Structure formats: structure tokens, C-alpha cells
Amino acid sequence: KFRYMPFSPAGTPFGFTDRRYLTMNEVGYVSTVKNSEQYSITVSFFDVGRFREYHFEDLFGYDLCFLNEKGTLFGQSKTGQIQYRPHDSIHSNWTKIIPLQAGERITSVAATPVRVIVGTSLGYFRSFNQFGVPFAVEKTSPIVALTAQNYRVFSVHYSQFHGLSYSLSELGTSSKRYYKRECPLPMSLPNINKDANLDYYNFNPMGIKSLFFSSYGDPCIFGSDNTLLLLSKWRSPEESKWLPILDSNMEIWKMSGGKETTDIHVWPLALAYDTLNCILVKGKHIWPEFPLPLPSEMEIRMPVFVKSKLLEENEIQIPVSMAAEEEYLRSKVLSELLTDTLENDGEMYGNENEVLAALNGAYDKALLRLFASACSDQNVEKALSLAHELKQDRALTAAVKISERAELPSLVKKINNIREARYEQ
Amino acid sequence: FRYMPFSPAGTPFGFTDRRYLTMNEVGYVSTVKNSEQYSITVSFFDVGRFREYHFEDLFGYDLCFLNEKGTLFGQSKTGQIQYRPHDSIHSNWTKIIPLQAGERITSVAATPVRVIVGTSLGYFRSFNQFGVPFAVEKTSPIVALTAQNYRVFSVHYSQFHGLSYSLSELGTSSKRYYKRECPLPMSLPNKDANLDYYNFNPMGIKSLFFSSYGDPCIFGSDNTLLLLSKWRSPEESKWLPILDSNMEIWKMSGGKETTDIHVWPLALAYDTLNCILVKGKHIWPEFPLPLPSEMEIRMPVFVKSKLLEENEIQIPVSMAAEEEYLRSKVLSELLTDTLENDGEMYGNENEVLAALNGAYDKALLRLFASACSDQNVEKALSLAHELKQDRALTAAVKISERAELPSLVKKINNIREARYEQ
Amino acid sequence: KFRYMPFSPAGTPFGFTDRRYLTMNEVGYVSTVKNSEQYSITVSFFDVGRFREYHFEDLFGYDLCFLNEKGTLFGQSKTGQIQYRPHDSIHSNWTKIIPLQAGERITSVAATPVRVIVGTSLGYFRSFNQFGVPFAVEKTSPIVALTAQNYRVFSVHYSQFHGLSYSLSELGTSSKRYYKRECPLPMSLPNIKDANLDYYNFNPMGIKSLFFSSYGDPCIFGSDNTLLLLSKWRSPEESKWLPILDSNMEIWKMSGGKETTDIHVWPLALAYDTLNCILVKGKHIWPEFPLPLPSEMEIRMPVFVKSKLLEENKEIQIPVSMAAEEEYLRSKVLSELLTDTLENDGEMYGNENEVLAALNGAYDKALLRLFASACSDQNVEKALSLAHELKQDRALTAAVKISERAELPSLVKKINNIREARYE
Amino acid sequence: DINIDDILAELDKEVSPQQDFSDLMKSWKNERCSP
């Protein structure tokens, strides 16, 4: 019975308003409005300079739009048409009519500089390269959503018989390797038990706000839970795992200073290194309206906080040790992802070296603060562990100072032994 | 779920006293409901190899795996399993498995090397070619059991695990699982004959069977042939809908879907599916078994709407070129996989690969001429990259001249230089 | 619909009583009792020498308890409060409350000698250290059970959509290795008496219990009442769950063929070749506060046709052939796992080498009984195949002697060729 | 039913102080009851 409604990353429903948004890539937002029997397609750009906001009137009503720097992927699921429009006039707006069997509806269409992907409701995965040339076609689980960057291709699939799953993949030169094949995604699913939210569900039954790769290309998805999930160590599936790096719900409740504000809503756009690019919608319609607001860019925060204690202590007021814990964990996961990119994916921005160094410093300072807290607790064992997790000897001597001023001479000896082992190694 | 027993490519009675337990290249086990007894007519498409003996079955074995060395006969309810070797020297040994309350043999895969028995509960079971137990284990509810050359391949659906499949081959030390209960992408079914076959085969898999080389293949309720390409490489393993029998029958039908036509794939003869076309309400073959109508492989790249707009269905030259391109690509890949693992089991596979390279490059050059007609430099250039041999580059540059596109000429020349130089 | 409820290994509900076993295992059992609002938690250790019993009152009403030689992990799902109590008592009972979002309820708690694990209804996997220092928080398919033996942690990831799944991993002090990740767990959920449902209310999944083996192989006992062991768990390629016991059949066996009902094996822990579990012969499948003496039953390969036994009986008689086959399979699987552990993890007791040797002997002698059976059938080919599997060449001398006593000169010649081949 | 039990047996054929104590205890009983 389920309806495989076509959806595109960060796309918005029609609602009673004829204007909508097919997608809101950080490059640009594809605002489309149904006028008469056609649709006025405003291909807007958050960077108008390199890509001016060209408009074209579409009589085909292309529903699935996938914006990207090379171009945009305008296609209509019902017609099987994919009128990709390169932003460069050098390449024409190549179009193709995909074979659609009875009831086949294009669930999503991913567009990448390497190639273009098109998923069908029947599970018959399809994908063609640029300038409309066939690339490959196969059968997989019903494609739910399609987010791909370069060779990387993250595909989400769901069936009423297979369950929530995602076949993360990348274009191995020999063939399209699948880091994860129909792996069970741990993402939260929408619960019917709101009219605008349900309309969005009628538009996005999966309640998936958007699928967008990180600044480093890491799989990042955002949905009903109002939290951003990152598949850490995705390049190593054996050890890969999803992390709720950010939680828009609690983050908004925090920026409200304990003043729960239902009207506020967050719309994913992208992940700028550590800050999540996402519109902070402020209307009944959880999705942005034609006058698209500015992007709200918030740093990730480990959801290690309990609203009750934060309210009791109190834009929220947070205990110094509790904030230290969150900062420590975020620094750990961040630096981990930084080294992952720098080594497995390779250094790209160049500044990532300094980013990792600063993350190491923050990791160590948070460890030192928590170690001082533990010494205040006199838990010599807990403080000793905290000192052990230090990743630099400067923090080790700082912890020696903390213990000495904390009158922990035995623990100072333990730190001395720690450094002995470390620098002697 | 019904979890009715299923044999490789079998038919129900359809409110009748005659049916087939299974259909295979080896044969088709036509059975008559001989009162309480069952005149199981073991029909062989090559009776010369083995005599079609109409042994009476008192147990009414619902399940029946048919391998050239022996025709198995399993009974899900009673749990008794009659294995009747096709060789008189080998006697028809029988066994009774311990079935738990509700446990029912859903399918069976009897190989000459080994025997495998699966049940509704998912309690995987196995014996030797004579019935000596090999191993027993619990798995997902068994729904399909296809095995040849001890290549145990199986499907498993569950209300909780869902549709899945356990591809495996019995290594000497043990059975290495290529794809252990991985999620099968087969499209589950949602007229009267369709309801009958869903009562008999609610799973919707018209038949689970390996390919000519031995690659996993299957025909779902979607009426499309799926083959697990790259199965020998789990990371690269992918299911390929190598046939859409709907699309094929539609094309041969002159743009006219005809329900009465129904295909029944016993196996895949490399590039031409071994199948029986039955024209009747009942999708399964009836007692007057139609001749095996081996269907040529056709990648379902054709657009049905575009195909009928073009109009045996007239096919665009470019679209047919693309279909040949994809068919030869996927084939060549499968042949290479089988040859690096199984080798030239036929002795013709290397020549088939050479012919596939030739035809694949021919389709590439035809699409290259099409792209040159499109005057798209990067299109024809990408097509030039796909070329494998040097004569393809000569043809590409010659066509680029034919379309007065010197930029291409230069690009193909550079690629040709880099190719034959290194 | 399904309901996510806190679970602990082999736990028991309060039922009509005010006291229930929070959990039980080889190390011991912890049972709580309602006491004028305040709950009285009692921690009982099986090995008196190793540890000392202690009881404390729990105002938080912790429903989740994990027991391991090092300590205990008491937690309350509805509150998110988690308290660890080191058994040594050298270290204070560090305690903390995890962040529980609306509806986030702790599904179970896992204790590792170095790390700590907490599972939530939302699948928010959380990792703390022995002193409670957080490690990281991860979202995964909701985990219903969190067995953790030594450094080996076995989790049961189930979802309404992802279905039944399990992840096997040994975090260890370092070199954390994930043997398996949310792979489908081949177990059968209960069918949907009042006590059965209440336990299902107390255990929606119907998991009778969850634990590792004596040597440390993951062990599961679902509502089906079948003990499944992950053969070759150390190697994911050949990893496979093998039903080593079907409690219902064994009970019907020892009952003299009688279809007893009240009997309920309460899985406690799996000794090598033998299951330590309590037979609750009462309406309540779970036991009572006056915990009875644990019972021991040897593992059995489920290859007995109940119809065959019924026909034999009309004290249950088993054909020597079907018996011998069962002992063959049991010895085979036991030797497989024993060798795997011995080569992979050495031995905590030196006897295991001799145990494996005797098991190989029993394996060969079971092949020999079945070889004689085939010889009596004149299936010299089947008997030849049997002797082919024979591991010991001295047992092969026994087999050729049998063939001589079976008057199978062709057989005898075949086994002689086998003698020479093995000598080669 | 070829009786290999002898064959399996031979294939298996491949001063305990406790015993001394048992002998003592038997002897002591006999002494007690013996006239």
C-alpha cells in the first residue's frame, strides 16, 4: 500500500502553496511553483556568482531535482524523463526517458560530476553518466533516496518486506563497490502519531528531511528525529558506525533557553566541516517558504546532555564538567573523522592538518578539565584513566600539575610512569 | 505467511489430478494424482539418458528436486524424503527427517556431491548422496533450495528477517557462504491463475536455478529473470534482471501484452534462457507440456512507451545498440568470472568472450556514430574510452571523420596512441 | 504493536509476587523485593569463595541488572539512572543518569571488565568506562539484550523494520574487533498462556535468556526453547548457528515419552557439553525466590524422530543407528568448536586436549557403529563413505575388521586401499 | 545386526590406596560377623 513518493534531498512539498522546493543543495535551492498546467522552475543559487539563478518554465513538472555544481538533474518520475541541465552552457541540458514498467516511479535521482544516478520504485536501480549516456542498470532493493558526491554513491532502500536499509557505494574503477549493501540504517522513522508535518510525510513518507554528504563526503542524513547521523569510519565498513553528531531538537530547545518553541523548525542543507548547514524554518510548515530564509549553520554537539539537569542548573546553562564531557567527546569524534579523511580519503582542504591539531588540543584540554574535576572528586582511579586517555605529553605534565595541586602524589607518580612509558616508546 | 512447499520450477494441480513436481533441463516430473497414490511420471527432455519411469508415490511427495544423477522426492508434512537416483546401479534410498510441530520441508536441493533439505522453521539439514547426514543448522525460514555441484544457493523469507538468500558452495573444509542470508532484491508479488500459483507459490519465485556456468539465477513473480552477477565476488556481487519476459513477449507480440502467454524457465543456456512457453490461463505449464522455448537474452533497456511510440516491435537502432552493449558487458563479465573460477567448462567460453568483445565494441562504435550524429564531442569521446581493441579506435576516428568532428579525431588518436604504446 | 521493554539475561517478572529475579547467570543471581515503596536488592553469588553476598535497598527501583565477576550494573529504564557497584568494593559505586529522550527507555545494560555499555529503546548505544567516564554514543538498531562475557559483547539488534539482528564484538582493552554487525539472528519469536504472555510482557522478545558458552561462544535461548550456538563465531565466513538442544524434545524424552507441560528449562548458563538451567515445573515459566538447585543436561543434536521413538515404545528406546548418528553429530560439532577455541584461545584447563582426543575417538567409533549398520545393509558404498570420514587409522583397522565380520570382501578391499592411502 | 560390540570393545581395549581402604572395610565387616 505504501506510496513511493519521489523525493529529492532537502526538497519540500507543494502544500496549498503552488510554490515548493525540489531540492536545497548548499550550492542552490530549486524553488518550483505550479502555474496553470506547467511549473515555473526557479533554479536559485546560494552562490549566484559562479552560478546565476537562471529560471526556466518547465511544462513537464520535473519533480525530482538534484542540484550540483556541474548542473542540476531535473526529471519527472511519472514520465521517466530526466532533463539534466548543466550550469555550464558548454554542456546542453541533456534529457532521457528511462524505461518505466507498469507502476515504476522514480524514487530519487542523484547527480554527480562522475555520473548521474536514477532510482526506481520497483528497485530496478538505474544510472547514466553525464551528457546522457548509459552507465549501468541493475535490480536492488526499492531505492528510497539518492545522495552521491563524485564517485561516492550513498543509496537508501526500503521495502515492506526487507525493511529500512541503505546500500552505500562508491564507483570502484573495476565496478561500483558497495561499502555497505542494504545495511540496516539506524535512522529514526516518522510516526503518524502535525497537518503540515503529515503533508510533508505525504510528500516524504520516510520523513527524511534530506540526504547530504559531509564536507568530506561522509554519509550524513537528517530526518524526523531532528538529529544528524554520520557514518563514522564508513570507508571501513567493518568498524563503521552511525553517530548522532547533532540533534536539532535539543539544539533549538537550547538556543531558546528552555523556552520550547514549536514554530521553529530546521531544514537540512549541508555539513560545513563541523557546522551543519540547514535552514531554521520558523513556520507551521516545517519546510522553508518561497521567501527562503538564510541558512542556519550550527556546530555539531554530542547528545550527552539531559534537559532536566540543564534546566535545574539554569542559551541554556550547562555544568562546566558536563560541557567538558560533551566537548571532549565531540573533539574525539571530530579528530577521528579528520584523520580518517586525511589518510583514507586523503587531505583535501590542506587546513585539515591545523584542524586536527586544534582538535587534539581541545581533546586534551577537555581531558585536563575533567581530570581536575575527578581530582576534586578524589577518584584517583578515574583521574588516572583520564590522564591515560591524553594524546599528548604536554597535557600529561599539566595533569601532573593538577594532581600536585590536588595533593595526589601517588597519582602524580602514576602520571610520571605514564610519561615514562610514552616518551620512552 | 503460507510457506507452501516448492520444488525447482514446479506446478500445482490447479483443481486437477495432474501436475508437475518440477521442471528442469534434466527433465520435468509430471505427476498424476493416482487416487490416494501418485503416478509420478519422471519425464526427461532427454529420456535417452534416463528412462521416464512412472513410479507410483504412496506418500504424495510435494517436494521434488531433479538432478541428472537423481530425482529427489520430499514430503513436507510427513517429512519423509525419497531420493530416487536416475542410475539403476544407485538404489532409491529414503529417509525421514525429525520435523517439529509445524516444521515442514519447504524445498530441497539434492546434488550429486551432497543432499540438502530445508524446512519452514529454517532448520537447515543435509545428508550425503545416499542419505547419511552431513550437517544440520538453524537458519531463516527456508523458501528456496537450489544447488548444483554442491553450490548450495537458497532463499529465506521471514515475517521479521524478511526476504533473504544464502548463496554458498561446499568447500572441502566447509561451506563458504558467498552471500549469507543477504537481502534478495526480488520483487515480491502484490488473475485467477495468478491466485492459484500464489496459493501454490506465494513466494512468487517461478523458479530458482543456477545459470549454464552455475551463476545464481531466479525467476520472480515479476516475470523477469534475475541473475546474481559477480556472485563469486561478494563485494561486487549484483543481481541483474537479464530478462523481462513481459518485455520480451511484448516485443515478439508486436506491441501487444498477451496474458495467455506464460514462460517457464527451467534453466539458462548462457545467452538464451531455457524456458517453456505455456499459452493458457494457468501460468504454469499444463499437462501437454509446451516445447522448451529457449529465449535469447535481452537486457531490459528498451523503453516500453518509446518502443510502442516507435511503432515484433520496431526498436530504435541506438536503443538496440545500447541493449547489445549492456548484454555483452554483463555477459562478458559473467563469462570472465566463471572462467577465472570455473574455467572453460565448455571449451568455447574464450571464443564467446572474443565474440562478445567484438559485438560490444560494435555496439560501442554504433553508439559512437550516433553520438557523432549528435555532434557531442564528450559523448562520442566517452564511447571511445569504452573501446577495448585498437580496431575499435580506428573505427571511432574514421566515424569522427565521417561526422566531420576533428576534435574527436584527435581525442581518439590520443587514446589509441596511449593504448597501443602501453 | 511490539513494545520495547527493559531486559536482563534470564530475568523474571514480579508476577503476583513482590519479588523477582532481576537476572541470573553462572556468577550468581540478583533478586529484588518490594519493601514499602523502597525496593530491596539482594546480590547472590554462586561461588561463595570468589565473592560475598550483599543486599542493598534500591529507591530508584532499578529494573535492569547485569552481573559479572567484577561488579554489577544496576539501572532504571524509565529514569535513565545507571549505577555500577564493583564487587571488589575497592572502588566506590560510581553512578550516573544517561540522557533519555521522550520515550527513550534503557533496553538492557552490558558490563565489561574495562568498559560499560547501555542500550536504549531508541537504539542509542552508549559506552562508558569502568569509572563511568563516557566513551561515545551511537545509534544502531534497537538492542533488546546485551550479553557480555569477559571482553566479548554479544548484542541482539531488533527492529520492527530491520527485523531480528545481532552484532558480535570483542571490545577488549584495545583492538576492538566487530566479529559481526547486526547480522540476521536465526531464532523463532513466540506465537501470539497468561503466564506466557506476562513473560512476553516482561520479555516482549521472548528470550528465555542470553549468554556466552563456557569457553565463550555466544548462546541464545528463545521462546522456542532451543539452545542455539554460533558455530565458528570467531570466523564470520563459516559462522553458523547450530541447534545443540531442543529442550521440548529432551523433556518429552526423559518424561518417558510423556508430553509434560509444567516443565520449563530456565536457561542459566551453558557449561561445555552441558547446559546449566533450572527446570521450573510450574505454571510460571520463571522460577521462584527460593531458587532451586540448578539442573544439568548434556547437549543433544536434535536428530530424533519423535515418531520413531513412539513406534519403538508403543525409558524411551532409541535405535542404535539413530543414536549413533546423533552422537556422531554431537561429537563432530563439539570437536570442531573445541579445536577452534584451543587454537584460537588456548585452554583455561589443560584437560581440553585429552577431551578433544577422546571426542575424536568417540567420533570414529560412532562412524564405526554406523559402518556396521551400513554393512548389515550390504551398502558397502555407504559404509565405504563412512570409513572415508574416519579420522583414526587404528579405527580404520577396526573398520576393516568389521567389514571382514560383515563378509564384505569388496568392502574389505576398499578399506585396505584406504589404509594404504592414509599411510600415504 | 553384525555384532561389532566385540570389535568396538577391542578397539577400546587400546594397589590403589582407595582400593586398599575398601578391602580393609570388607575385611573388618567379615571379622565383626565371622565366628
Q: CB of B69 within 8 Å of any CB in chain C? A: no
Rounded-to-integer distance, Cα A108 and Cα B59, Å: 52
Q: CB of A263 within 8 Å of any CB in chain C? A: no
Rounded-to-integer distance, Cα A295 and Cα A266, Å: 10
The dihedrals phi and psi of A103, each to the nearest 5 degrees, come to 85, -5
Query: Residues A136, A142, A145, A151: what is their CA dihedral angle, to the nearest 10 degrees?
Result: -30
Do C284 and C15 form a contact (C-beta atoms < 8 A)? yes
Which DSSP helix (H) or strand (E) runs through A419? helix A409-424
Do C162 and C182 form a contact (C-beta atoms < 8 A)? yes
Rounded-to-integer distance, Cα B420 and Cα B409, Å: 16
- Count residue pairs from B and C with Cβ separation < 8 A: 77
Rounded-to-integer distance, Cα B387 and Cα B371, Å: 15
Breaks (C-N over 2.5 A) in chain A follow: 193, 314
The verdict on B296 and B322 lying in the same domain is no
DSSP of B46-102: TTTTS-----EESS--SB--EETTEEEEE-TTT-EEEEEESSTTS---EEE----TT
Three cell numbers at B172? 572441502
The candidate with the shortest Cα–Cα distance to A181, out of A171, A170, A166, is A166
Task: From A304, A323, A351, give the residue that closes a domain.
Answer: A304
Task: Kindly provide the residue ranges of all beta strands, DSSP E only, lying in A173-259, ordered along the sequence.
Answer: 176-177, 208-211, 220-223, 227-232, 241-247
Please return the burial class of A5, using the count of CB atoms within 10 Å of its CB with bins 0-12, 13-18 and 19+: middle
Rounded-to-integer distance, Cα A19 and Cα D23, Å: 104
Rounded-to-integer distance, Cα A284 and Cα C307, Å: 67
The candidate with the shortest Cα–Cα distance to A170, out of A182, A184, A154, is A154
The verdict on A43 and A101 lying in the same domain is yes
Q: CB of A133 within 8 Å of any CB in chain B? A: yes
Rounded-to-integer distance, Cα C32 and Cα C24, Å: 12
Rounded-to-integer distance, Cα B53 and Cα B36, Å: 19
- Beta-carbon contacts of residue C40 (< 8 Å; ≥ 6 apart): C32, C33, C34, C55, C56, C57, C58
- Beta-carbon contacts of residue A131 (< 8 Å; ≥ 6 apart): A91, A92, A94, B376, B378, B379, B382
The verdict on A359 and A211 lying in the same domain is no
Q: Which residue has the cell 538529529?
A: A227
Chains that touch C (3 or more CB pairs under 8 A): A, B, D
Q: How many other CB atoms sit within 10 Å of the CB of residue C136?
A: 17
Rounded-to-integer distance, Cα C387 and Cα C376, Å: 15
Long-range contacts of B250-257 (CB under 8 A, 24+ apart): B250/B304, B250/B307, B250/B313, B251/B298, B251/B302, B251/B307, B251/B312, B251/B313, B251/B315, B252/B312, B252/B313, B254/B311, B254/B312, B254/B313, B255/B307, B255/B308, B255/B311, B255/B313
Cβ-based contacts of B137 with chain C (< 8 Å):
231, 240-243
Cβ-based contacts of D10 with chain C (< 8 Å):
398
Q: For C186, which of B98, B130, B138 is closest by C-beta distance? A: B138
Task: From A243, A271, A304, give the residue that closes a domain.
Answer: A304
Report the half-sphere exposure of A57 (CA within 13 A, side-chain side): 5
**B252 three-state secondary structure:** helix
The verdict on C260 and C341 lying in the same domain is no
Name which of B113, B161, B172, B175 to mutate to probe chain C: the one with the most chain C Cβ atoms within 10 A of its Cβ: B161
Rounded-to-integer distance, Cα C21 and Cα C1, Å: 26
The verdict on A271 and A350 lying in the same domain is no
Pairing relation of β-strands A169-171 and A152-157?
antiparallel
DSSP of C88-104: T-SS---EEE----TT-
DSSP of C209-275: EEEEBSSS-EEEE-TT-EEEEEETTTSTTT-EEEEEEEHHHHHHHHTTS----S--EEEEEEETTEE
Rounded-to-integer distance, Cα B24 and Cα C40, Å: 68
The verdict on B94 and B43 lying in the same domain is yes
Q: CB of B73 within 8 Å of any CB in chain C? A: no
Rounded-to-integer distance, Cα A184 and Cα C163, Å: 9
Task: Kindly provide the residue ranges of all beta strands, DSSP E only, lying in chain D, ordered along the sequence.
Answer: none
Identify any residues that bridge with A169 across adjacent strands, giving them in sequence order: A153
Do C370 and C331 form a contact (C-beta atoms < 8 A)? no
The verdict on B250 and B393 lying in the same domain is no
The verdict on B242 and B363 lying in the same domain is no
Q: How many other CB atoms sit within 10 Å of the CB of residue A385?
A: 18
The dihedrals phi and psi of A243, each to the nearest 5 degrees, come to -130, 125
Do A91 and A20 form a contact (C-beta atoms < 8 A)? no
Report the half-sphere exposure of B107 (CA within 13 A, side-chain side): 30
The verdict on A283 and A318 lying in the same domain is no
Rounded-to-integer distance, Cα A93 and Cα A198, Å: 35
Cβ-based contacts of B121 with chain C (< 8 Å):
188
Helices (H) and strands (E) in chain B, counts: 8, 23
Residue A407 backbone class (left: φ over 0; alpha: ψ -120 to 50; beta: rest)? left
DSSP 8-state secondary structure symbol assigned to residue C359 = H
Name which of C90, C101, C104 to mutate to probe chain A: the one with the most chain A Cβ atoms within 10 A of its Cβ: C101
Q: How many other CB atoms sit within 10 Å of the CB of residue A193?
A: 3
Rounded-to-integer distance, Cα A333 and Cα A335, Å: 6
DSSP of C386-424: HHHH---HHHHHHHHHHHHHTT-HHHHHHHHHHHHHHH-
Q: What's the farthest any 2 CA atoms get from each other in chain C?
A: 82
The verdict on C281 and C398 lying in the same domain is no
Question: What chain D residue is nearest to C395 in terms of C-alpha separation?
Answer: D11
DSSP of A274-324: TEEEEE--BSSSSSPPSS--PEEEEE---S---HHHHHHH------HHHHH
Q: Give Cα separations from C192 to B2, B332, B386, C205, C283 (angstroms).
A: 17, 51, 58, 12, 18
Q: Please name the residues between 365 and 384 in chain B that touch chain A, using a CB distance below 8 Å.
A: 367, 371, 376, 378-379, 382-383
The verdict on A379 and A272 lying in the same domain is no
Task: From C303, C336, C357, give the residue that closes a domain.
Answer: C303
The verdict on A343 and A243 lying in the same domain is no
* Residues spanned by the domain of B246: 1-301
Cβ-based contacts of C401 with chain D (< 8 Å):
7
Method for this entry: cryo-EM
Q: CB of B140 within 8 Å of any CB in chain C? A: yes
Rounded-to-integer distance, Cα B116 and Cα B124, Å: 8
Q: Which residue has the cell 565458528?
A: C232
The candidate with the shortest Cα–Cα distance to A258, out of A304, A311, A312, is A311
Q: How many domains does chain C have?
A: 2
- Beta-carbon contacts of residue B340 (< 8 Å; ≥ 6 apart): none
Q: CA quadruple A225, A230, A236, A241: dihedral positive or negative?
A: negative
Chains that touch A (3 or more CB pairs under 8 A): B, C
Q: For D2, which of C372, C395, C398 is closest by C-beta distance? A: C372
